[PDB]
Curated annotation (Swiss-Prot):
Disulfide bonds join C6-C127, C30-C115, C64-C80, C76-C94. Residues 1-129 form the C-type lysozyme domain. In the egg white and polymorphonuclear leukocytes. This is Lysozyme C. Its EC number is 3.2.1.17. CDD domains: LYZ_C (cd16897). Lysozyme C is capable of both hydrolysis and transglycosylation; it also shows a slight esterase activity. It acts rapidly on both peptide-substituted and unsubstituted peptidoglycan, and slowly on chitin oligosaccharides. The keyword Cell inner membrane does not apply. It comes from Gallus gallus. It catalyses: Hydrolysis of (1->4)-beta-linkages between N-acetylmuramic acid and N-acetyl-D-glucosamine residues in a peptidoglycan and between N-acetyl-D-glucosamine residues in chitodextrins. It holds the Pfam family Lys. It comes from the Eukaryota.
Amino acid sequence: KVFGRCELAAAMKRHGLDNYRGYSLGNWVCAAKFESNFNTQATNRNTDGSTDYGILQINSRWWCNDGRTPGSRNLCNIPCSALLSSDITASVNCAKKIVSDGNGMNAWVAWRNRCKGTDVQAWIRGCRL
């Protein structure tokens, strides 16, 4: 599924991401924009042989199991395919563990490079939340 901007904001808010670990909803919408362009089915292979999955491009080495990744830990205890669902619940649950891991949203390199420090509130501007 390809979410609309305000549609994704509302879904992320309903699943308790607004201000989770102190990150406003615009931070999460901005991260999803640059990780996946709001497409739940986005996948990207990394040079280390891992793959990133879903709206927040969660990786198969630490977080989800895809059956083909060396050094796999599956810390979210989920098949990576669950992160491609139209239902963002698995992505949100796994993102909450990632952002709790010590480095906050710096875990998402696109968030650090394209969202951090910017006027992230613009990503929820106009939305009925």
